[PDB]
Each structure stands twice: as C-alpha cells, then as structure tokens.
C-alpha cells in the first residue's frame, strides 16, 4: 500500500495516543527529525521537504474525493468553497450564491478560477483522522484547507496567514515563493494580512516547484504566493495550527485576574490615586518636566512588575486547555480501544431482542483513560468539571462544551486516572472514600466513552 496507508496501519498498532500523534508527525516531516524541526525550524524558518516519492500522501485526498464531495455532500459557496482568481495584480472572488454543485464549481475551474475548500475534515474521514491525531502533538487545533488550481494560473494574491502552515502537495506541480517577514511587526503576525502586490515584496527566501509528496512549511507572517504553469494543475492540502496561541494571548487572560487578585490581597493596589494626577498625566501633559509625572510612571511600572506574583497561571492554563477541548475534533479510536470501550460493547439487536446485555464493571476491573487528549479536569466556582472531546462534532463548535461534574470524593481518583495513561489502574485501587465511589466514577466514565478496560467486560 501507500506510505500514508502504511503509517496509518501502524498507528492502529500503537497503544498510547501520545505516541500515535508523535509517530504521525514524524512521518509527516520525514526524513527530518521532529526534535530538530521544533528546536530550530518551528516558527523560525521556512522548510521544504523534497520527498521524492509521489505516492507519499496517497489515500489522504484527491480531486476525485472533492468531486464526489461537491456532489454527495452539501457544500455551500462562501461557507465551505471559495472560487478565487488573481489577474493583473488584482484578487477577485466569483462565489455564486448557494450550493456548490459540480456543474458550477468545475465551470469556474474551467474559467481559470482556483477552488478553496474550507475544513475538508468535516467530510473526509481520512483528513479528520489525520488532523484529529496531529492536534494532540500540537497542543493546538489542527485545521486544513484544500486548494485546487487550474493550469497556467494563480488564484491568490501574495499574502501571509495567521497560522503555522504545512503545505502537502497531493497532485500536479506548483511554483511556490515564500518570503521572510518584511518588517519586525510582521514577524509571527497575529492577524492575517490583506492582499499584497509584487511591488510590496522583496526577494524570495525560497522559490520552488512542489511535486506530489513534498512538504513545505513556513511560519505565520511569511508572505507566500503560488501559481501553476506549463499546462498542469495543482492540488494541495494546507494544514494549519497555532492560531492565537502565543504568550500575549495567555497574558491577555492572566492580567485581568492578576490585578483583581492583587487588589484583593495587597493594600498597595487599593490605595487611591493622586487627587491631582490629572494635572500632569494625559496626552496634553505628555510634553512636561514635572517630576510627579516621572514618579507616576515609576509607580505604574513597579506595580505592574509585582503583578506576576499574583498571576493565576494554573487557572488560565485550565481555561485554555478547556477551550482546546471544545476546539478539538472528536477522537479516532484504534480497533483495540474500540473493542475495549463502551463503543465496542458486543450488545446489539439481533433477532427480536437485544443480545448480550448486563456488562458490569467490578472492583477487579483494570482501567485507564480511553486516550490522553480527550478530557481535562477544570475547577470553576468551587466546582470540578471533567470536560471531554468524545462528543465533539467534526464541524468546529457545532456542539457546545461538554463536561460532567466530579465530586470532591472522586477528584482524587480522577486526577490519578488523567496522570496514569496508559498504565492500567484497577478500580479497586482507586483512591476514594468507599467502594461505592470507586465503582461510581469508573462506571460513569466508562459509560461516557472516556474509559477502557484491560479486558472486554462480560456479563
């Protein structure tokens, strides 16, 4: 089979979902080591991996998969599919109002337009699994866009995006040009840029024709543009991640809580401001010599620096974690996990009644979390909530945040479980208050598809 189907097959044969994600990423950038890539390339340099194996991504996505998608799925223009053109320095969009029927889409294609399909994971099970696995090692949502460009044309103007982009060339060839950030402010930019023109660009740091199987990575802020030539089309899937997952976004959540804490715990933050500070502070008093102004400025800095001591970093981490649980795509279980989870319980309906009912967990049952990135224990208003991802839709935020409450008498074993993965812990050895608690938690988690047993449960 193809390299993609061979590695996918391997993943099924690996216990830990953490190892699974690490193994897939290793495959994605092979032969270069993930450790080198993360300590030297990630967010610092554009990276081109010439695979020299056109079959590398076979089974991931094709123009046929898209053809059958537009025809069988309800793909909507403007929402899921975008037809773009770039001619004589101007970007244009010829998006018709409505469903993207093959007749209309391919028609645009013939007219010289490029097709951009947002989040193919919402339809392709193979793309979903690919991304669903990679998100775990990114610690950040992994989305993707598919780009289809006709021969001798360019559908997009030069621009930079707000995420870390991995361009996987799936069909055809395409001449790419990646530019280093133009100015300091553009380095690792927060928001996407507008459409630029050649006159706004310097020399390319990397210019090359991509061939099926190659991988091209570049950080957010790197301007890039691509075009087809010599009578051949191009199809590629761009894997993006790390959208607004910077130190700033973290501080953005910290500060508010930190200043609130500092005020509640330290009187220096509760002291009143000067009665007349408005006499020397303000835009009109910028050009002043008053020493009270320099003292005001010094006081502000001093107070700001203290804030670090009151920062609830753990709470914010849990909230980010929680948001990442809501953002995550639902997990793709291995055959083993399935067979050992409530999802694979033998109970079904066969002749005129349900068969094999009565599967119960005992104190002897050995268990462990279905996977390492499906749930998170978060504290909110003296309450403990176990947020999970198993019930998430493949469509971003289609479903609201799912969680179940955990009582103090179970928080201890719940912690252990989230930390024991993939080690098997016997229910009887769960650190609780009573046997009723140990079976309670285990049963509640199991029935929610958040837990698996060492052996399949039998009546």
């Amino acid at each position: 089979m193809s390299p993609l189907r061979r590695v996918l097959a391997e993943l099924n044969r690996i216990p830990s979902s953490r190892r699974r994600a690490a193994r897939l990423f290793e495959w994605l950038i092979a032969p270069m080591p993930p450790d080198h890539f993360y300590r030297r390339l990630w967010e610092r340099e554009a990276v081109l991996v010439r695979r020299q194996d056109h079959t590398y991504y076979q089974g991931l996505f094709s123009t046929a998969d898209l053809d059958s998608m537009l025809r069988n799925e309800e793909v909507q223009f403007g929402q899921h599919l975008d037809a773009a053109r770039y001619i004589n320095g101007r970007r244009e969009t010829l998006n018709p109002p409505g469903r993207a029927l093959p007749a209309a889409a391919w028609s645009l294609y013939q007219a010289g337009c490029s097709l951009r399909l947002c989040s193919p994971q919402a339809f392709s099970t193979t793309v979903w699994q690919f991304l669903a696995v990679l998100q775990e090692q990114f610690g950040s949502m992994a989305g993707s866009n598919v780009y289809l460009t006709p021969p001798n044309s360019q559908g997009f103007a030069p621009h930079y995006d707000d995420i870390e982009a991995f361009v996987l060339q799936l069909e055809g060839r395409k001449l790419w040009r990646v530019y280093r950030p133009r100015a300091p402010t553009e380095e690792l930019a927060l928001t996407s840029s507008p459409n630029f023109s050649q006159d706004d660009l310097g020399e390319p740091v990397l210019q090359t024709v991509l061939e099926p199987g190659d991988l091209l990575y570049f950080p957010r802020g790197f301007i890039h543009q691509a075009e087809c030539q010599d009578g051949v089309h191009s199809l590629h899937l761009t894997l993006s991640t790390y959208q607004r997952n910077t130190w700033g976004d973290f501080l953005e959540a910290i500060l508010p809580l930190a200043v609130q804490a500092a005020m509640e715990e330290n009187v220096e933050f509760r002291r009143g401001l000067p009665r007349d500070f408005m006499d020397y502070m303000g835009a009109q008093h910028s050009d002043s010599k008053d020493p009270r102004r320099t003292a005001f400025m010094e006081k502000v800095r001093v107070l700001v620096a203290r804030l670090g001591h009151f920062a609830p970093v753990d709470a914010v981490a849990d909230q980010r974690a929680k948001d990442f649980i809501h953002d995550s795509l639902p997990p793709v279980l291995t055959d083993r996990e399935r067979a050992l989870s409530v999802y694979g319980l033998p109970i079904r309906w066969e002749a005129g009644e349900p068969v094999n009912v009565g599967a119960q967990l005992t104190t002897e049952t050995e268990v462990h979390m279905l996977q390492d990135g499906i749930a998170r224990l978060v504290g909110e208003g003296g309450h403990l909530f176990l947020y999970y991802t198993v019930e998430n839709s493949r469509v971003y935020h289609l479903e609201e945040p799912k969680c179940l409450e955990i009582y103090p008498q179970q928080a201890d074993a719940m912690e252990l479980l989230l930390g024991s993965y993939p080690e098997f812990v016997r229910v009887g050895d769960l650190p609780c208050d009573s046997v009723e608690d140990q079976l309670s938690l285990a049963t509640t988690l199991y029935d929610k598809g958040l837990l698996l047993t060492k052996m399949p449960l039998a009546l």
Binding site: D82, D161, D162, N195
Partner: peptide, 10 residues
C-alpha cells in the same frame, strides 16, 4: 477575497 481559513467563515 480571503486567504486561508483556519475556521470556516460565517
């Protein structure tokens, strides 16, 4: 026209 959509637009 827009560029890459990490999340699908409204």
């Amino acid at each position: 026209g827009g560029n890459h959509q990490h999340i699908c637009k409204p």
